[PDB]
Amino acid sequence: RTVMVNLNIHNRNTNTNPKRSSDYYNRSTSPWNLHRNEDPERYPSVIWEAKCRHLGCINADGNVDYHMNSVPIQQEILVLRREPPRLEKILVSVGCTCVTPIVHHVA
Ligand SMILES: CN1C(=O)[C@@H](NC(=O)[C@@H](NC(=O)c2cc(Cl)c(Cl)[nH]2)C2CCCCC2)COc2ccccc21
Ligand SMILES: [Cl-]
């Protein structure tokens, strides 16, 4: 039911320095690696998702504390998918945080 938009530089990645962000977040007690989620039937075709590096959280000494748990923060965002092969909502991991597990550790 919706119409026209211009796909250009104002709606695609122009960040050429991802290491600036990763070096900064690598100082987190719950740091993360990145999954390159590519789907050619989707706009952005590439979505970078956080994958927690550790099961526990990194302490002041540089060691892992297994009393805590590094966990993916989830968010729901909109993506365009090709119609015919349309606006779709998807759940994505946006980063990691350090939590005190109430029941189990998310692995
Ligand atoms: C690591 N990384 C990113 O995250 C990039 N972001 C995106 O390409 C796209 N957003 C994500 O993927 C994203 C959003 C959420 Cl919410 C999660 Cl989760 N993921 C973004 C591009 C611009 C249009 C809208 C989508 C930007 O910097 C980079 C540069 C080079 C290589 C990797 C990265
Ligand atoms: Cl890429």
UniProtKB/Swiss-Prot annotation:
The keyword Disulfide bond applies. The chain holds residues 43 to 155 of 155 of the full protein. The keyword Glycoprotein applies. It comes from Homo sapiens (Human). GO terms for cellular component: external side of plasma membrane; extracellular region; extracellular space. Changing W48V: Has no effect on the affinity for IL17RA. It comes from the Eukaryota. Its main location: secreted. Homodimer. Forms complexes with IL17RA and IL17RC receptors with 2:1 binding stoichiometry: two receptor chains for one interleukin molecule. IL17A homodimer preferentially drives the formation of IL17RA-IL17RC heterodimeric receptor complex. IL17A homodimer adopts an asymmetrical ternary structure with one IL17RA molecule, allowing for high affinity interactions of one IL17A monomer with one IL17RA molecule (via D1 and D2 domains), while disfavoring binding of a second IL17RA molecule on the other IL17A monomer. Heterodimer with IL17F. One of its GO terms (biological process) is innate immune response. Expressed in memory Th17 cells (at protein level). It is found in: Secreted. One of its GO terms (molecular function) is protein homodimerization activity. Keywords: Adaptive immunity, Cytokine, Disulfide bond, Glycoprotein, Immunity, Inflammatory response, Innate immunity, Secreted, Signal. Disulfide bonds join C52-C96, C57-C98. Induction: Induced upon differentiation of CD4-positive T cells. Up-regulated by IL23A-IL12B. Up-regulated in peripheral blood mononuclear cells upon West Nile virus infection. Belongs to the IL-17 family. Effector cytokine of innate and adaptive immune system involved in antimicrobial host defense and maintenance of tissue integrity. Signals via IL17RA-IL17RC heterodimeric receptor complex, triggering homotypic interaction of IL17RA and IL17RC chains with TRAF3IP2 adapter. This leads to downstream TRAF6-mediated activation of NF-kappa-B and MAPkinase pathways ultimately resulting in transcriptional activation of cytokines, chemokines, antimicrobial peptides and matrix metalloproteinases, with potential strong immune inflammation. Glycans are attached at N26. N-glycosylated. Found both in glycosylated and nonglycosylated forms. This is Interleukin-17A.
